[PDB]
Amino acid sequence: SGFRKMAFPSGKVEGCMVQVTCGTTTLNGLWLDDVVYCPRHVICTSEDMLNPNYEDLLIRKSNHNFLVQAGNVQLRVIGHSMQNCVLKLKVDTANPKTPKYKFVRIQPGQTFSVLACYNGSPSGVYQCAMRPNFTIKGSFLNGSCGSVGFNIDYDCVSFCYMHHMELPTGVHAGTDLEGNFYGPFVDRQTAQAAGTDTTITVNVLAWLYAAVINGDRWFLNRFTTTLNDFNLVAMKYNYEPLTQDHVDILGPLSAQTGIAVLDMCASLKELLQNGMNGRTILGSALLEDEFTPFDVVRQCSGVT
Amino acid sequence: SGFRKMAFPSGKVEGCMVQVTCGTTTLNGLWLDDVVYCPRHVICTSEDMLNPNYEDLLIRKSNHNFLVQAGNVQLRVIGHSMQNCVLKLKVDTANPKTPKYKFVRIQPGQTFSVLACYNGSPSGVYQCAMRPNFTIKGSFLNGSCGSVGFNIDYDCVSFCYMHHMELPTGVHAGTDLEGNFYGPFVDRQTAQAAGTDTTITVNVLAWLYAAVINGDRWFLNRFTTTLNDFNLVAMKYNYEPLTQDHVDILGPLSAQTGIAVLDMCASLKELLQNGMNGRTILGSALLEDEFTPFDVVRQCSGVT
Numbered sequence A, B: 001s002g003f004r005k006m007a008f009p010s011g012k013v014e015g016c017m018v019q020v021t022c023g024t025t026t027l028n029g030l031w032l033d034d035v036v037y038c039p040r041h042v043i044c045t046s047e048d049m050l051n052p053n054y055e056d057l058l059i060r061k062s063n064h065n066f067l068v069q070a071g072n073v074q075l076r077v078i079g080h081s082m083q084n085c086v087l088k089l090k091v092d093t094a095n096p097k098t099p100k101y102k103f104v105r106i107q108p109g110q111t112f113s114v115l116a117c118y119n120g121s122p123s124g125v126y127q128c129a130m131r132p133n134f135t136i137k138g139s140f141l142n143g144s145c146g147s148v149g150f151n152i153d154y155d156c157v158s159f160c161y162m163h164h165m166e167l168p169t170g171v172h173a174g175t176d177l178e179g180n181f182y183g184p185f186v187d188r189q190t191a192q193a194a195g196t197d198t199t200i201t202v203n204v205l206a207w208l209y210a211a212v213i214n215g216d217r218w219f220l221n222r223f224t225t226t227l228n229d230f231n232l233v234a235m236k237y238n239y240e241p242l243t244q245d246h247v248d249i250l251g252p253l254s255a256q257t258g259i260a261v262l263d264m265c266a267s268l269k270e271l272l273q274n275g276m277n278g279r280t281i282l283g284s285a286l287l288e289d290e291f292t293p294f295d296v297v298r299q300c301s302g303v304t
């Protein structure tokens, strides 16, 4: 028992982290096979960041200008190309520590682990969700760019995020591993609207089921609701509308606890309308939305 | 910017995890050099757990009864000994992945990362604090025993905890790597009093400084207090009394923010007396005590 904001073991990803330097800038790269992936803004200088012409900036760079170092050994760069907002640096050596991997584009509301790195060295690992508005609320300082987000299923790492930027509002933005930003963001030092965010309803319900499994049950009530009635409350509280697809994904947790999804919705409705009254659920005084139903099942079943 | 409950990268510890089987029981072991460390309760059966005579149980076991497997390779056991509540299984092969390490006994209120494992395989990593009452609020299922807690400074892993047991109250208990339990716990299936816990005052103040650094400042007020006055409030709210040693450890954060420690105490006093009024601090609606002052400095400075 017990429920924690658990990250995946980071070892397989630590083995892929390298340092990339171009001119005056140093950031992180991801070395998989004979390719190093990193944010293209590694080629920018102070005068560039406001509106960089990346094509022009990259044309002034040659293979020998990209300094890639894996621990204490220098990697030899034999090719470079820009794909969307990432640079792919071909190197002459395949990473001997390349795990089995995939590049995936995660959906908003899904979760993943971030291995925060500085100078190609890992500093820490934490779990987070991709917000409905495609930002992440991470912990990133200057130099953390190129740190990646991922999920692990068995021996396969699915890389889903590469860190690029902190918006002036303190929230974080980045790309999939093909360099496509999540959300409307551009890699420029400009004020950028993130857009209205909402709470991930299916995840709050999943975490309510985790609470019941782990013994926190005070919020369970004698009520039920419908998807329509619950969604009118979700509208009022800036929660994502719940769909039958969400109900279906909660099926395993509803079967394990014997609590129908709509009955759990009625508990969530009462908590939204009345607050926690100074009580806590799984050590939290707010409704947690960073655990997906799959995360709850995995942590409650001990998948390795 | 941003502040997260960050764990250490787990790679160095993943390389040390093995599976240990004795009779009908399977749990985790820690393979460092030519020794595998694991909870001694691996030698118990159903009839034993109520009050096991570990000396007698171990006398019935021989080296060949301890099945140790590192991934798919079997390790050969050439010695066994019990030290307090841990078994040390000498094997004929030194772990090639042994990082630089130390065994340390952490103090209550200090934090560490836990690599939850099942069948010698890592499932996840999370950060937690050793409560003032020497329990931990982790996420552990049956089979997680032998999972370890640790801190990493540069290239050295300081192992501080090995998981042994879940008390009937759902909280967790374990030992240092010499097999000495933290707290008054015994490795028996019996009801055991954990004792009054308190909130780690120095950590809440550290996290309040992290909030100010990261832009959450609404709780800062025009007041100050004294150690004496603050401790009368800490007494009322089951907080650890603050000492000058705690104030000294908060020095770096007080210098960085320009907010005197006693002024931060006055903010904490008002938050204890008035609550959060429905507001949040660093995404939390309660006063967080699982970040030490060193953790705040490290995460805010990006130490790798």
Ligand SMILES: CNC(=O)Nc1ccc(N(Cc2ccsc2)C(=O)Cn2nnc3ccccc32)cc1
Residues within 6 Å of the ligand: A024, A025, A041, A044, A045, A046, A049, A050, A140, A141, A142, A143, A144, A145, A164, A165, A166, A167, A186, A187, A188, A189, B001
């Ligand atoms: C000397 N050059 C230099 O320092 N180059 C630099 C400088 C800043 C950035 N930018 C803006 C930007 C410009 C163009 S694309 C993005 C970032 O957002 C980088 N970033 N990401 N997470 C961060 C957390 C804390 C502080 C900075 C952080 C990128 C590159």
Ligand SMILES: CNC(=O)Nc1ccc(N(Cc2ccsc2)C(=O)Cn2nnc3ccccc32)cc1
Residues within 6 Å of the ligand: A001, B024, B025, B041, B044, B045, B046, B049, B050, B140, B141, B142, B143, B144, B145, B164, B165, B166, B167, B186, B187, B188, B189
């Ligand atoms: C067949 N034998 C078997 O299952 N042996 C066993 C069975 C239970 C335990 N005990 C009690 C105990 C007895 C003696 S010392 C401790 C644990 O507390 C083990 N534990 N630890 N974290 C857990 C989380 C969830 C459930 C169980 C968990 C130890 C060994």
